Amino acid sequence: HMKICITVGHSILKSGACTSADGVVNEYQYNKSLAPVLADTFRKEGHKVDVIICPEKQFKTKNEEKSYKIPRVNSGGYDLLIELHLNASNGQGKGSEVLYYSNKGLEYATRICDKLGTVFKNRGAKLDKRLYILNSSKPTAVLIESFFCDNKEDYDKAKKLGHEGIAKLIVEGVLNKNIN
Ligand SMILES: [Zn+2]
């Protein structure tokens, strides 16, 4: 029914430096693992999905993440873009949060937040027009901050749910239905 693009946030630079947040779990690595599970969960409901992950040990700087992602996002004729992130603060911040650009994006964001909110703290959908992944993407886009990578309790919940458990909540939210 929908053609969906899933980008994984951040990358591993040529230096070996990872550009993501890092805490009790590495953000990039977690989302590299989640992305294909999320895609398959969408696919089970009949949607088509492309997963976009930056090449590893190719980029000189983080600036190449935009240059890599944007043309591919914009050449695929997608109905929806989702970029997967994990949040971070000082260890005390926790919960789920979805960033959006438009009123259409807000609809998706709120439902995703409510679904994740069944397990994590619902921090709410938040408008951010400054992010390139949102302001330079043709399709409606949302940036999902599923939980905090520097909060033990959040990550313990995630490992309890599993990738499939997190995926199901995101998919139910985006699709506005119950999968069970
Ligand atoms: Zn991130």
Experimental method: X-ray
Q: Is 10 annotated as a binding residue?
A: yes
Sequence spans of domains, the chain: 1-180
Provide the 8-state DSSP code for 62.
Answer: T
Q: Nearest-CA neighbor of 142 among 106, 179, 115? A: 106
Q: What strands lie across the sheet with 140-148, from one edge to the other?
A: 48-52, 3-8, 80-87, 140-148, 96-100, 122-127
Cα 100 to middle of ligand 1, angstroms: 14
Cα 172 to middle of ligand 1, angstroms: 22
Cα 87 to middle of ligand 1, angstroms: 6
What residues are neighbours of ligand 1 (ion), with CB under 5 Å? 9, 85
Question: What DSSP string describes 147-169?
Answer: EETT-HHHHHHHHHHHHHHHHHH
Q: Report the alpha-carbon distance of residue 116 to residue 151 in Å, rounded.
A: 16
Cα 20 to middle of ligand 1, angstroms: 5
Q: Is 27 annotated as a binding residue?
A: yes
The SS3 call for residue 46 is coil
CB 122 within 8 A of CB 175: no
Cα 49 to middle of ligand 1, angstroms: 21
Which tokens go with 129? 């027009």
Q: Is 47 annotated as a binding residue?
A: no
Which tokens go with 40? 């398959």
Which tokens go with 108? 């998706």
Which tokens go with 42? 């969408």
Alpha carbon of residue 173 to chain centroid: 13
Secondary element (H or E) of residue 75: helix 64-75
Which residues precede chain breaks (C–N over 2.5 Å) in the chain?
Answer: none
CA distances from 16 to 55, 60, 139 (A): 12, 10, 32
Looking at domain 1-180, its CATH architecture is 3-Layer(aba) Sandwich (3.40)
Provide the 8-state DSSP code for 56.
Answer: S
CB 47 within 8 A of CB 29: no
Contacts of 75 (CB under 8 A, 6+ apart): none
